[PDB]
Scaffold this active site. Sequence first.
Site, PDB file in Angstrom:
ATOM      1  CB  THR A 232      -6.297  -3.614  14.358  1.00  0.00           C
ATOM      2  OG1 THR A 232      -5.591  -2.993  15.440  1.00  0.00           O
ATOM      3  CG2 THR A 232      -6.413  -2.633  13.204  1.00  0.00           C
TER       4      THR A 232
ATOM      5  CG  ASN B 207       0.544  -3.266  19.062  1.00  0.00           C
ATOM      6  OD1 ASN B 207       1.744  -3.527  19.014  1.00  0.00           O
ATOM      7  ND2 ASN B 207      -0.089  -2.629  18.088  1.00  0.00           N
TER       8      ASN B 207
ATOM      9  CG  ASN C 104       6.435   1.818  16.064  1.00  0.00           C
ATOM     10  OD1 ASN C 104       5.899   0.743  16.321  1.00  0.00           O
ATOM     11  ND2 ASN C 104       5.931   2.676  15.191  1.00  0.00           N
TER      12      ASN C 104
ATOM     13  CD  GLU D  88      28.821 -16.825  20.420  1.00  0.00           C
ATOM     14  OE1 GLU D  88      28.474 -16.205  21.447  1.00  0.00           O
ATOM     15  OE2 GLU D  88      30.015 -16.959  20.079  1.00  0.00           O
TER      16      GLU D  88
ATOM     17  CD  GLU E 256      -2.714   1.259   2.524  1.00  0.00           C
ATOM     18  OE1 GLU E 256      -2.367   0.531   3.479  1.00  0.00           O
ATOM     19  OE2 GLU E 256      -3.665   2.065   2.591  1.00  0.00           O
TER      20      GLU E 256
ATOM     21  CB  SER F 162       1.715  -6.654  12.448  1.00  0.00           C
ATOM     22  OG  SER F 162       0.618  -7.043  13.256  1.00  0.00           O
TER      23      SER F 162
ATOM     24  CB  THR G  24       1.716  -5.735   3.442  1.00  0.00           C
ATOM     25  OG1 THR G  24       0.820  -5.096   2.525  1.00  0.00           O
ATOM     26  CG2 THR G  24       3.130  -5.612   2.912  1.00  0.00           C
TER      27      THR G  24
HETATM   28  N1  LIG Z   1       3.448  -1.606  17.727  1.00  0.00           N
HETATM   29  C1  LIG Z   1       2.966  -1.180  16.566  1.00  0.00           C
HETATM   30  N2  LIG Z   1       2.002  -1.914  15.910  1.00  0.00           N
HETATM   31  C2  LIG Z   1       1.507  -1.487  14.724  1.00  0.00           C
HETATM   32  C3  LIG Z   1       1.962  -0.308  14.159  1.00  0.00           C
HETATM   33  N3  LIG Z   1       1.306  -0.124  12.995  1.00  0.00           N
HETATM   34  C4  LIG Z   1       0.452  -1.154  12.810  1.00  0.00           C
HETATM   35  N4  LIG Z   1       0.558  -2.001  13.880  1.00  0.00           N
HETATM   36  C5  LIG Z   1      -0.178  -3.260  14.070  1.00  0.00           C
HETATM   37  O1  LIG Z   1      -0.690  -3.679  12.824  1.00  0.00           O
HETATM   38  C6  LIG Z   1      -1.988  -4.213  12.951  1.00  0.00           C
HETATM   39  C7  LIG Z   1      -2.831  -3.784  11.757  1.00  0.00           C
HETATM   40  O2  LIG Z   1      -2.459  -4.479  10.587  1.00  0.00           O
HETATM   41  P1  LIG Z   1      -1.213  -3.996   9.691  1.00  0.00           P
HETATM   42  O3  LIG Z   1       0.083  -4.584  10.187  1.00  0.00           O
HETATM   43  O4  LIG Z   1      -1.157  -2.489   9.695  1.00  0.00           O
HETATM   44  O5  LIG Z   1      -1.538  -4.511   8.206  1.00  0.00           O
HETATM   45  P2  LIG Z   1      -0.546  -4.095   7.014  1.00  0.00           P
HETATM   46  O6  LIG Z   1       0.849  -4.570   7.329  1.00  0.00           O
HETATM   47  O7  LIG Z   1      -0.583  -2.602   6.821  1.00  0.00           O
HETATM   48  O8  LIG Z   1      -1.125  -4.833   5.709  1.00  0.00           O
HETATM   49  P3  LIG Z   1      -2.508  -4.335   5.061  1.00  0.00           P
HETATM   50  O9  LIG Z   1      -3.597  -4.355   6.105  1.00  0.00           O
HETATM   51  O10 LIG Z   1      -2.891  -5.234   3.914  1.00  0.00           O
HETATM   52  O11 LIG Z   1      -2.313  -2.929   4.551  1.00  0.00           O
HETATM   53  C8  LIG Z   1      -2.549  -3.663  14.250  1.00  0.00           C
HETATM   54  O12 LIG Z   1      -3.109  -4.702  15.016  1.00  0.00           O
HETATM   55  C9  LIG Z   1      -1.371  -3.063  14.987  1.00  0.00           C
HETATM   56  O13 LIG Z   1      -1.166  -3.741  16.203  1.00  0.00           O
HETATM   57  C10 LIG Z   1       2.930   0.436  14.813  1.00  0.00           C
HETATM   58  O14 LIG Z   1       3.340   1.483  14.320  1.00  0.00           O
HETATM   59  N5  LIG Z   1       3.431  -0.005  16.019  1.00  0.00           N
HETATM   60 MG   LIG Z   2      -1.398  -1.190   5.432  1.00  0.00          MG
END
Ligand SMILES: Nc1nc2c(ncn2[C@@H]2O[C@H](COP(=O)(O)OP(=O)(O)OP(=O)(O)O)[C@@H](O)[C@H]2O)c(=O)[nH]1
Ligand SMILES: [Mg+2]
Lengths: 50, 431, 55, 437, 437, 104, 54
Positions: free
Chosen positions: E179, E206, E228, E254, E71, E140, E145
């Site tokens: 989410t 999270n 982060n 190790e 995206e 995640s 993705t």
């Molecule tokens: N700790 C942390 N978690 C994040 C962050 N951004 C997204 N997440 C996690 O990502 C989850 C949402 O799905 P995404 O990982 O954003 O999905 P994506 O990788 O963007 O892939 P698509 O949904 O197809 O666009 C949430 O449950 C969040 O916990 C971040 O900046 N920090």
């Molecule tokens: Mg995304």
Amino acid sequence: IGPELQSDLETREKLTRPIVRVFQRHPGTNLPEAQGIIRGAAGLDESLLR
Amino acid sequence: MREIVHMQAGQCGNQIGAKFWEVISDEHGIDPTGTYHGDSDLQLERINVYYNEATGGKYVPRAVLVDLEPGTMDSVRSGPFGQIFRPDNFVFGQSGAGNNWAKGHYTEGAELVDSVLDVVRKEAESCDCLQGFQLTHSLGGGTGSGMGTLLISKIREEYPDRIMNTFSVVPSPKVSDTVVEPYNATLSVHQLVENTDETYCIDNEALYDICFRTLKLTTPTYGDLNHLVSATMSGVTTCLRFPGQLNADLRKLAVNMVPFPRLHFFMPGFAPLTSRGSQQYRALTVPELTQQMFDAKNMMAACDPRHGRYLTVAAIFRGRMSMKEVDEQMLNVQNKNSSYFVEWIPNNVKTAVCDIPPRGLKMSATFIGNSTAIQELFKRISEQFTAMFRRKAFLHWYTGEGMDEMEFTEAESNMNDLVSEYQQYQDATAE
Amino acid sequence: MYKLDLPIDLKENAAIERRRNLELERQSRIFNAKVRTIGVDVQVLKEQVHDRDLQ
Amino acid sequence: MRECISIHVGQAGVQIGNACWELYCLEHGIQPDGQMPSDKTIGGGDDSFNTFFSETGAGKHVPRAVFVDLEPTVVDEVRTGTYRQLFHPEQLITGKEDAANNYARGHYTIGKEIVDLVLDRIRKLADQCTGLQGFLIFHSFGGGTGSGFASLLMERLSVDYGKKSKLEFAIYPAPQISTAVVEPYNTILTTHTTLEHSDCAFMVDNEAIYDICRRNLDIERPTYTNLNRLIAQIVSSITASLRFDGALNVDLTEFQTNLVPYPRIHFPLATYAPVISAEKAYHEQLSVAEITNACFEPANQMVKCDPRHGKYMACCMLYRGDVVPKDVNAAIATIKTKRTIQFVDWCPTGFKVGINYQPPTVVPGGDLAKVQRAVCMLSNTTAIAEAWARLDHKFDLMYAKRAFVHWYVGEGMEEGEFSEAREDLAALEKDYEEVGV
Amino acid sequence: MRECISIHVGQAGVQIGNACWELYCLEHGIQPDGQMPSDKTIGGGDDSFNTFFSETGAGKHVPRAVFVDLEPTVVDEVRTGTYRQLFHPEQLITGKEDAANNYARGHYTIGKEIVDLVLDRIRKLADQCTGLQGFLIFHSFGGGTGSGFASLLMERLSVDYGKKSKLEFAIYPAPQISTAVVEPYNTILTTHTTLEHSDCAFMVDNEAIYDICRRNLDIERPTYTNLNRLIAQIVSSITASLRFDGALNVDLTEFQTNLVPYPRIHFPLATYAPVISAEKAYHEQLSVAEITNACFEPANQMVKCDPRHGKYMACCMLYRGDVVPKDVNAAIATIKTKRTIQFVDWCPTGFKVGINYQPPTVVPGGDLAKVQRAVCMLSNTTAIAEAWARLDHKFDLMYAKRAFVHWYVGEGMEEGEFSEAREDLAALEKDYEEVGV
Amino acid sequence: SYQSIPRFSKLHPVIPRRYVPEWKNDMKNRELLVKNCEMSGIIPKGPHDESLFLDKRERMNEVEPRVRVEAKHPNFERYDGLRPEFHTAQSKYQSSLMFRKDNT
Amino acid sequence: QTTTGGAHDYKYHGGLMANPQHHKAPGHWNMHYNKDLREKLQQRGWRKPLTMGN
Ligand SMILES: Nc1nc2c(ncn2[C@@H]2O[C@H](COP(=O)(O)OP(=O)(O)OP(=O)(O)O)[C@@H](O)[C@H]2O)c(=O)[nH]1
Ligand SMILES: [Mg+2]
Ligand SMILES: Nc1nc2c(ncn2[C@@H]2O[C@H](COP(=O)(O)OP(=O)(O)OP(=O)(O)O)[C@@H](O)[C@H]2O)c(=O)[nH]1
Ligand SMILES: Nc1nc2c(ncn2[C@@H]2O[C@H](COP(=O)(O)OP(=O)(O)O)[C@@H](O)[C@H]2O)c(=O)[nH]1
Ligand SMILES: [Mg+2]
């Protein structure tokens, strides 16, 4: 088949590993490992084309 | 240095060709006096393809104006840009044509054909390397049809190696403008099939639809129609007159479009055409220029390409642009409209790029389409022919000044054979 | 033409030692592997960037 | 002493000539008037311009090129544009009417009026050399002058000039992108001349250079000019061993003897690295390993066929710049330890290395970033059969219906040309396949 | 001779990568345009940045990372952010169509036109290296993705690089916080195919970091930036032994050999101590034993799973700062003697200690205080069976009625993948249970 | 004199360029090495074709017969490899082996 | 404006965007090293001319 660099063979899986060098320090040898992976690669290639 | 000899016959030919000469005159910078008044040397370098050095800086057209009767030729002389023409290129009788093919061809066209051949011989032998002839006329009348076909036949007999372009505006689907135009069109195309190298069939209904839909134009008049036809002529001959990234002359277009010698009837088109009040809403890109080219409403032929298949396409672009963009756009339109192209010829597109666009424009484009949809036009003319040939209406005339019914039978059979070939190479598959 | 004498010999020796100057230039470039392998010139790259932006 | 004659035939060839000679003038410091400002030379090797520019009078350097196009438009634009006083007027040869994408017009009717004059001018250009390395003949497979007249030209040259190199830079039709309809016919027809009269044919694809300029140069709308400039870069990197000294100098004879194993396998691929812009030259390393892996890169070849499906036969590396064999051997070892590169069975030693001192020269107002290291890779891979396969399919499904044949037949050309060129193409396909296995 | 290629895939990957390389640039003194300044003792002789930043002739220190997302707008936030000209332009790979929280869409339809180019970029980043030690991959398990393209990418990396250490940093879905709705599908289907392509897989949650920031950090309204930042700290603590020397030090291999008991039990939890603020830490006697205890409370981990219900198997501690190893050994003795911690009977020496001299680096805007002592715990324990049980229950509940399955079938999946992933996780649960007994 | 005409196996990107076995060129104790290849009579001891691997291929030529090369089987079947034990490194492949069923 | 006319403008060789031209070598049949011979023949100035009187 493995990685695209045989400088990166991860010495454990090598046909000149120290174990097989100890093997080929004496006559005889010629392990059926390279021919085995030849046959496996051939069979997987025919499966891919089919 | 190649040359084109331009001949215009009939009142329609003498109007459209005069407009064409005026358009290329104020495109090359020629003033109404006849002298050069441009700014760049590109307008002056390749000027012999249409003009002759008359007096110092004065350039005269290589036009030959033909009519049975001094009608619109007098108005062309008395209008603007009318004294640029050489005064003895006007060949004219005093009898009429009467919208009669045999009057134009056999009886009354016989007394003028020797004079026209003398004039065009004097014009053609002056050129060091003559390329071809360009006739403008109508397939609905007597002078444009009869004398036009006779002139094409005699010019082909004297010079059987030059490129013959005919524009020859064809009868309309709706509204007639001449009640004997099925006979006229059939008897004219019977010789346009076996003589001309290429023909650009234009329909006035398509021109009216272009003016109404793509140009608003509540009062079009014939000036805008002849202007559009003139723009298409300039687009198809611009590669001779200005340098470009990829040149394509008349012989190259003829080679790259016609697969077989019988099929040489095209669909001309011009882009970009913008309704007055939409230039701010549109943005000029090569993709929109190409999509306007391949739009079905943009061509000056009333037959619909969706009811047919594109045998070949010629795309002559004019403007500073990218060959990658041009080739990518042609590939994109060919891939998306994959059912409108013949499958047994890949890349049914001949591209050309000229570096000099028309004045007031950034990019212009000329589309030439050899498609199998021309069979609709020929089937309409054949149907309106055989509607009255079975009752022998309007045929006592043609019998009176002296042809036989076997000529009409041979003409309709030739038209039916052309329809059969255009239908054959629409459903014929590769393998 | 001309006679082949001391100015011609001086021109020849100037050519020899010009060749020497060029090859010591190349030696200074190549024996300095930070220049030899990971080189390329920032000033010319910046001018070309500005040319592309202006175009 | 190391002279080389350039013959640019066709509109495409004349455009290659424009880019090539502007780059040669920028490399050797000849102004477009034709003068060298600083010329402290004796002769016999130090005259690096002598491979391209001859000598006359008070310091005038006329090029060793012949420009041929039947259409008098592009060559006339050359005659009235910037490099006006540089070229001798009789080298710029024109006609009256072009062949108009027709091999029969270019070879049988229009062709034998200008070819005698072209051969006389070629003889006059070659008689003034003191030993000739070869002919760089630049043309197109699109058709017309680049196919028919060029075919007659290589035929006459291979008859009379005999034992001289005939390196033929031909631009090739793309798999999908094309600018003509009789282009498959012309391309199939000009196969016999490049098989039986050329000594080394470099086929290059316009769509591939478009992809290279789109991906590495960030040019979203590339024109023919960038393609011409990069082909000029390639041919200059090829010829630079004849002009500037290096650690390992490779002339054309060594180059051919190291590429071609058989006389019918003279179709290598040319690629150039790096072809980046300056913003990427900021964030790139540009060392010898990087610019050799970029030469072996699948989406960096200049025809649309990846060599993953093929087998490498003989690779001629031409390193250009501050390049040392300490780095060259490391790059060669890194390549030969890579699975993706698949060398042919009967060639263990398959690398010919030539190292030059002079770095490539950047045109003031081009696209390529000025770099101090470059590789010109000339690899004789057997993956070029894909191009023959695509033109084979196009020619099959065109000629099955006998479309666009009456032009060739009526222009003095027997219809067995198509069948014999078809059989020659199939012979090349089968030969490359049995070599690859 | 020591390097780590970073792959940040997904939006969660890219934001973690932004915070991570902010931390890396601050640790190594890299300015946001990417240049080490001049001098002051270590000048022209520094290799603390060798694992992360390459070198160029423009002075730019090119990152050894790939930010890939199907995206837009997030790679575009990177490209228009503060680190605009730090990153290489081709290192920032973006698509056109979003993966739509869909494992099938990210794995089978949209991710197949990006995987070849991202493998090409990984090949360039790897052949820029001579001593590559691993691939640190951040994403995640939420979906799209980070689930499908990440799984396909690690399959291709396993194919193309052998079994090089592919370290995994996975944001595991929370028990209560959520989410997406298709998170059980996107997590089960990626656990099945990434259970055998990552050598170690640090889970992070999270909700647990939310509780940590709310309780031990007084950041009552936190965002993703703090999460982060803690993830950046806990990755930098792992990698710091490759960049700063000192006491007992541990590389990427190790601690793998000392951490994973069995090849399918490679899912450890991670903990950082002392997570603390400035005004909170000012009243404190921050020391080695109590920060070991700080890693050892059940309400201090980064995964919401109670370790008191499970048994510890292998604990790799990573101490940083002026840490004397006698305090480390005393802390190990105390946590071994106290009976609240339960260890498996087949691991008497269940600890692997790595001590580095470099204290952690704080950021101007972060929440962690500048401290002397720190510790990063990577704990492989059988308490993750609760997380697998919750995920399995949600997967079975939402799969019993075939809810949200037509999307996966439309973008290229069966029920066979769902069923084999279910029984794969059942086998993993059984293996964890029998190891626990 | 005689004729060799060396042959080789088909290609594989695991074979590490040239590799001769040690015993063919093991000259600290060679004087009783060659009699071990003399009493057996199935191992040629000639100076030529020492490269057991030349480029990326195995030598099928006069270095041992094809029998006794493939005869060093420790009796491993597809039954064992499709259900690997947990504590070995072959259980790293379980999800790709459980899709293979079990028939032969 | 023409495409090739606007592209191939007057390009100025040399300057910042150029490298020093590394010439190959002069010819060994041209290269005689006679300057060293001149400076050697300058020495031993007590010579007599090779004439009949000496
Ligand atoms: N700790 C942390 N978690 C994040 C962050 N951004 C997204 N997440 C996690 O990502 C989850 C949402 O799905 P995404 O990982 O954003 O999905 P994506 O990788 O963007 O892939 P698509 O949904 O197809 O666009 C949430 O449950 C969040 O916990 C971040 O900046 N920090
Ligand atoms: Mg995304
Ligand atoms: N790369 C590149 N290709 C060009 C250029 N100019 C023309 N071409 C190619 O030329 C082909 C068209 O045929 P031409 O080479 O122009 O034909 P010709 O040699 O001029 O001979 P005629 O057809 O008689 O005009 C196209 O496929 C183009 O790819 C150029 O400047 N650069
Ligand atoms: N586009 C256009 N068509 C015209 C013009 N004048 C006449 N026509 C067409 O020509 C046809 C009549 O043919 P005509 O020229 O009168 O034949 P002629 O009497 O022998 O000259 C009609 O169908 C008109 O549509 C004109 O100025 N422009
Ligand atoms: Mg041409």
